[PDB]
Design a protein around this ligand. Sequence first.
Ligand SMILES: [Mg+2]
Length: 750
Amino acid sequence: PGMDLLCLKDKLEMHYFGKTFDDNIHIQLIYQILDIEKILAVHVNNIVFTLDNVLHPLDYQTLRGQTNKYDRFKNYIKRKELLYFGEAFYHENERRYEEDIFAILTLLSALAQFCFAHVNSFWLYQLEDQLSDEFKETLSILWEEVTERIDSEFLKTNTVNLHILCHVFPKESKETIVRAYYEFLIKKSFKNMGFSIKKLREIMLEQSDLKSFKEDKYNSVRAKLYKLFDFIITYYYDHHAFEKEALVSSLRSSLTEENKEEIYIKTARTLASALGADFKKAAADVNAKNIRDYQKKANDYRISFEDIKIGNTGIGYFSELIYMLTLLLDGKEINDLLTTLINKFDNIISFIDILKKLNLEFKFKPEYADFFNMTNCRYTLEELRVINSIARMQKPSADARKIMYRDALRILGMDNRPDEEIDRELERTMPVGADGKFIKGKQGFRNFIASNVIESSRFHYLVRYNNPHKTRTLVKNPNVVKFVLEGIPETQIKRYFDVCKGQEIPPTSDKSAQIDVLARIISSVDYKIFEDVPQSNFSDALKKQRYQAIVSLYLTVMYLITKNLVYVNSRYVIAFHCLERDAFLHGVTLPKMNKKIVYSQLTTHLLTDKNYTTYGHLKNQKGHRKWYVLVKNNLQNSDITAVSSFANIVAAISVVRNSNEYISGIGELHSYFELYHYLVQSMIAKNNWYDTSHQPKTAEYLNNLKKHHTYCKDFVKAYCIPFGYVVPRYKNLTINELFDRNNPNPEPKE
RNA sequence: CAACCCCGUAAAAAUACGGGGUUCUGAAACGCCAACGAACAUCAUGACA
RNA sequence: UGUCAUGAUGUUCGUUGGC
Ligand SMILES: [Mg+2]
């Protein structure tokens, strides 16, 4: 009755709650708690790698007494490439105090030590009684800085709709409209109702009362109309209250889907007859004149609402930590981290409701009781919502731009040269003159680099994750370049080809013809071509666009390789994190031999267990013995040293770092899976991370790689055997067709 | 695209084939990616007391 | 130096195609 395949129901229930239950609602609740740590660990590992790449290697009172850790801290905090991170260590063009930087580094180290599994196992869930009083101030200062920013910035960028809403509602204070509308979009009070207001709006639109807004001229404003109807709806339920309560009971007591549709149609039609005039009044006030007039007077409302906001309210110690992680990430990574966490906490709250409704036990153990209860899980959700809804520009400062000029020219030529030659070329191209000024009328190279390289999101990704000294080798191999261009959709390629065409090639519609032409342009690019850009005539206009297209194509190719190789490494970090978590509960410790770790001990133990072999993934029955044999077959082809060496590569991300010594001998590519594994097998080759005495089969694996210049499929099935106890994960990480969920190829026939 | 469990007709194997399940299995799907749009903030351009 | 036009770079919502 609800027993899981991994055979860990009772252990998890007794670890979290305190006893065993005959129901299938608690274990699904526990898996979400298990899930959040995975993404948290992935991103912590990424941040640590970036910090170690950019910066080459009691309380604060003890720090000075050490005289050795103090010496390292004095220079590490003085190392002046900290400017690459926007607001982590520099605010208002001045360096933060040493204590705050020490606090951030120590907190990052503690979180990294917690996830990759000294600190207790309860650290993340009880921070109130474990955090020192000195570390409770650093988080407060950082959040006080942003709470003043959001207050002044929220009362703008939408000062068109909010004026009309207050005009519709006369008998309400200036506070009330702002409070309700802030509760509407900043933190979604619209989300936590069982109604479908968007569907209800469509059903009302089927009525002639408010479908008179379907004119073609209404296309000038669409988004600022759908939102307005929603807020009017959500306040209508708020004032009625009892009517909303009755509708909930009626919907919950529905028999079939036809009854639900009839009630929704009846509910929609009576709403139109209820406040149809109100709907008409708001929608008739929108036009070009009023929008421009209201935008002119954007300071007619003065509401502070400082008391409500979590900047002054006692924001939790857990949500402040997430904000600290946000300062060390970019726009794309923030969305992935926060959106996953919101989904996790939404589902946790719902499960507790089911347990309460059905009259079942829901209290946790005394250790988890403080954090995991119904009220706290609500509060921690809107705090995660308000963090995600912050506008970020991430401009490249004003002092950090001097360093960025040095690196920008290193990508485009003079890779691995002394800093003396870098400065001379900067002086030679764009001069300074007298009194440290800038020579007017003779400077167009700086504006080109500043507005197309320094202020680009692709460029920041490369500097953080890759070394600009050795980044040029990524575009020297035609096979790698050709594959990346094929991934770009067809619509972009046609645009790029026409602009970068030149005057020596004819127009051709063959996609393969265009790719080869673009490959030669990208291969040979130097900054010396960009020394004649029109300063401040259709010839000048065409030449400016042509130069812009080439540099964007240059960085796009490099940015995709780095991003996708990191993604593949992130998939294997999750796999190793689950092994340590699962081996602890089963009672199986991972031993050592010759200062190594046998990562294949768990799968050996589970191959000879009666319960797992009968009620688990690896099954031994007449008709269900396929994957029991294959894993047992593939176990006898594994090297202890090779598994240990692979674990170190995954943890430290050595594929991205040492990719310039092996990407010059690749044969032919078809997916990012092949490129990642070719590099991994290459390192094991020359570094001699194997042993043919204990397994004479690794010898033939390495011979196939060199004579074919492509990865060997059998060899990846050997060192991934520590994941053999979970069949779906073993298949996904060892067969290329099942790796990416965007490939419809079938599993190869054996 | 794969794993797991029910009910079917042949069968005893690393079991094929036809219907339904699965937050208690793994893949970012409340997610990513392109082209057209309405706002807004940046930077380089002509008209002026 | 404030304003009006003018083309470029990037966030934010929404319509439509593809995963
Ligand atoms: Mg799951």
